[PDB]
């Protein structure tokens, strides 16, 4: 049926079977959050939090949202304001990729930046003080329950709805806010116990695993300081992924599979693989990839890539 | 429900309505293609060509296809190779964005450029040769009844289901191999005669309207000849649309609808949005909207765009 | 997503494979129309018509919808009616099943019945009286364009969609109004012309293929006369069915596949049963399911049918019989 | 997408707004069970316990499955025994609806009737005695996790994902197995604990409120024991609504609105009608229909209906009177 608003197509995202990926006496199956309109999972923080302010009479028309971004909250943020009728102002670390710049300002979005060394620690509070210089609205993803909520009632009805009846033995993802952890995780514990929720954290940037905190490439994924929105008692298994293994194994989800997702996307899925190397028969498995592969193109993902005609290769 | 491949999410994408940029008479929706796991309505004619092939026994595992593309085409076809285990080789104008070169890297594709001023005309050629030489499967998206059938059966199907029951009056669409134009034109003839199909071209590439062709910017559109799919009875209206009209609607679409969309997507709802300013009351479009903006943040579209930091403006 | 009105889940019915009653060498799908709110494929027409004539401003609220109906349609223009605000009155044979006059009377519908020898020809003609005398607004859905349109645009567009890169070379009907065959049939047409559709009759009225029509047990089908809205060109083969064998492969359908349809229903699967026997390996067939069996309790759908307690065979059982 | 399975279409049934039976200041949604293949809810239960005993390997192709049941169970794992090739007994009360002997019937069900003032505390034992005689899998409905677990993972993210960022004040149902209140219940419990759960009972069987029981005519509901998967503590408001409120409201709902729904269905909505009378405005509430009115024709849902011609009223028009 026809849609009122293009964030009427937000959520029910597919999850789909990896072919061959899989260590075969395993199912490993992915959900592909790059369907959202925006591109990410963070359509989903975006109208939620949007929705929950205007309820809350925090957020009138040509009001301006502020918030600290590691870049997709920032596009999904700016394309909520876009279509409802607010300004938003974006603070980014100087680091992530230019794709996710270049999206804000394609929705009409505001850019302040600052030194990514600083971290979102840094960012939020640049955030802060020009909300209040201003008097701007901030969406707090790192502490707003309307983060998880959508969370628990969308993301976490969709796999529900989509494994009820089947086997699922284990739900891996990553986390910036937590909100997807989190909401998800508070879910599959009251309707399926067994299920072990895995939370990865980088290598190089093990907050909750080592109280460790550094720059790292999987973007989205690693703020330097514990979220208020998470309920650490949902994690079952913190382990740990390095940003290499996760930049390869996106690559490989695009090129054996025809998957194209971010690096937490391959970082998940990395994860994933691993426990299904050493996990029983049957073990069916859920990962989860937070954004397209699109927005990466200037990044790591693509060191060693050929832009030019493939002569040499033709020669053969 | 889950899905077995990630090729079972094309189709079915979503009608939006435009929320502020019709003109108050009317109304105006728009089919984004950019939902299609490839990120562009190319994934219908990618999955179709190559099911249809399979049917005739003409590929196997292994096999290499090979096409001339604008980009979109390359990428889908370089998609669906990755997921199903065929090698793909696209030959491409070299003036193409560089994120369809990167994107169909992505995938494992193979990558062969040519001097852009050629048009396709000179692509087609190329990858005559190369699949006569290497015995490579050709595509021939210009040529393949398989492309129009797939439009036929789920883009027009999809079109006539949202609208079932109420009013439609124009379709806009532009056109590369002309297999949506074509396809979906054939449906609405029989099933909704009174719908007017309009197609448009660049004004610096009327083809059709003017027997010219120039190189141009609304990617996708408008090879330098006539296509061997398409079916000339089925447009109502031809007319054109300039590329810097398309280019700023397709900014107006994202600012201000929170809607990305490439070129080709500017050109149709610009050319909608004409069409709305002089029509009568309750007059109801729908216009394609091709591909995502995203593999445009090297092109025009972004022309003049500040990829700094907001100081000027927080200044005051 | 939530739904503002009833009327917005009509149509997109799911079709399904059958898993052990189709020859092995084949498979059978079946479009199950019982999902529709009204319980039948009439639902797509009854909004179709109501729409286009609230469109063209033949119908205001509080208007009266009048019909002469083999019971489906009743039943829904009731629900589209009790839905929009609107009065409804059918006019049905005295020998359809009482569960339909009953449905028709729950949605607030109005019934006026008449011997049922006089089909469908008798009905219209009281249905034109009434109307005349009364000013109600008539469906005509035996000519009314609006009937195979809404069919072209949603029934044959889920049927596209769903098979899309698929194969398919068989798809089954019945037909009444003939509006499911003429809408479907030139979609199917213009898409996969590859596609044979095949339409059957009643054994005992042929009236497309010889000019036959009686009284017969397949409600729903065969009125006696051919339909105006009938587009006979997109016909690939005409056939027939008796209602003995419909009624018994409706039998075969809920107890061998858990799929509880009418008699038309029957009939259908049963064509495409019988083509599949003889036909290629590989070949896939589409039969339509019009409605649930659940209108059928009292009819000879359920004839032998014990509503008593099988101590019979709970004794059977201790022993060694 | 083409189905491969008639058992794969259950579950994601509609949720719709009442268009006119709902106080101006508020609405009132429903959640309509009767999309589901079997026609009710019970589907989801049926297809639930049979997936896990087959994981658990209770079950085998050829097994027999029994169960004392109110009808729509007996009616939907009679379903899902027929679609994947298991045998089914279904233990019903004599006073249970006629229909529900039949549809049981037509997926190929077996029969064993009781004396229906015994309850299904009584049907239980002879169930269980059935099952110790011949060695059948007993569904447990009323004590099986895999019951509310089904609701949770289903209903519940059905619900929560239609109204996500949306205003929901009041979850209305009534319970048979309690399966439905406790799954939901509980979901909505972690995620919205703002909603109002209301469960009802009908007047003449507040078994929960005040330990009463009776032979009642909201058929599904109130079995005389209070069952073993309830979860107590999801309840907000216990309430009850009596079976004559609840017969004239599922009319309302079909002649008002188009939807035609069962007795219980009637009682849910009765039941938010009269929370919604005395609430504030804007206050959004949802109410669940188990099943369709069509297995009620021989119910008193249908006393006083004329399965006549309407020539009285017909006579009526041409006067002034
Ligand atoms: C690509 C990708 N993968 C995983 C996640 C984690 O999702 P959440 O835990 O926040 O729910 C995110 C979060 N992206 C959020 C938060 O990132 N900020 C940090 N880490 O400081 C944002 O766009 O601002 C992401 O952009
Ligand atoms: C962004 C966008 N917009 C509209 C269309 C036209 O669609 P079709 O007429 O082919 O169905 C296309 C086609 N893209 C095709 C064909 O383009 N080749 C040309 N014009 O020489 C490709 O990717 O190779 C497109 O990439
Ligand atoms: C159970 C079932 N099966 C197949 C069909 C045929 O569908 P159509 O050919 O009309 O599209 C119908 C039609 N039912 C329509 C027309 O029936 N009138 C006749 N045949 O005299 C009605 O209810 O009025 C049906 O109720
Ligand atoms: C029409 C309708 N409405 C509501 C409910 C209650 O649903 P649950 O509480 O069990 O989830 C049911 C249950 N029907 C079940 C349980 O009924 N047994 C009782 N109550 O003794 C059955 O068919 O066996 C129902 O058939």
């Not at 979005?109 to 020009?130: M, Q, R, T, W, Y």
């Not at 309307?146 to 739900?171: C, Q």
């Not at 940003?243 to 994860?271: H, M």
């Amino acid at each position: 049926p026809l849609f009122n608003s293009i964030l009427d197509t937000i959520g029910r995202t597919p999850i789909v079977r990896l072919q061959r990926m899989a260590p075969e006496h395993t199912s490993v199956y992915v959900k592909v959050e790059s369907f959202n309109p925006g591109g990410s999972v963070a359509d989903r923080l975006a109208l939620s939090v949007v929705l929950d302010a205007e309820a809350k009479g925090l957020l009138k028309p040509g009001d301006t949202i502020v918030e600290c971004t590691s870049g997709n909250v920032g596009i999904a943020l700016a394309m909520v304001a876009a279509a409802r009728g607010y300004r938003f102002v974006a603070v980014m670390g100087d680091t992530y990729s230019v794709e996710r710049r270049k999206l804000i300002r394609a929705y009409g979005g505001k850019l302040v930046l600052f030194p990514g060394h600083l971290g979102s620690k840094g960012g939020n509070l640049i955030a802060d003080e020009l909300a209040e210089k201003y008097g701007w609205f901030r969406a707090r993803q790192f502490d707003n329950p309307a983060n998880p909520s959508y969370h628990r009632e969308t993301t976490a009805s969709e796999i529900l709805a989509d494994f009820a009846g089947k086997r699922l033995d284990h739900f891996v993802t990553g986390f910036g806010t937590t909100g997807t952890l989190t909401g998800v995780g508070q879910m599959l514990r009251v309707a399926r116990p067994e299920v072990r929720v895995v939370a990865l954290e980088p290598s190089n940037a093990a907050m909750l695993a080592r109280g460790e905190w550094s720059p790292h490439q999987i973007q989205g994924l690693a703020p330097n300081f514990v979220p208020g929105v998470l309920d650490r008692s949902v994690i079952d298994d913190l382990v740990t992924m390095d940003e290499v293994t996760a930049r390869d194994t996106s690559r490989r989800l695009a090129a054996e599979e025809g998957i194209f997702a971010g690096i937490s996307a391959g970082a998940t899925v990395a994860t994933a693989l691993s426990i299904a190397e050493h996990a029983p028969e049957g073990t069916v498995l859920l990962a989860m990839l937070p954004d397209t592969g699109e927005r990466y193109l200037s990044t790591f993902l693509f060191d060693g890539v050929d832009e030019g005609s493939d002569d040499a290769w033709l020669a053969s």
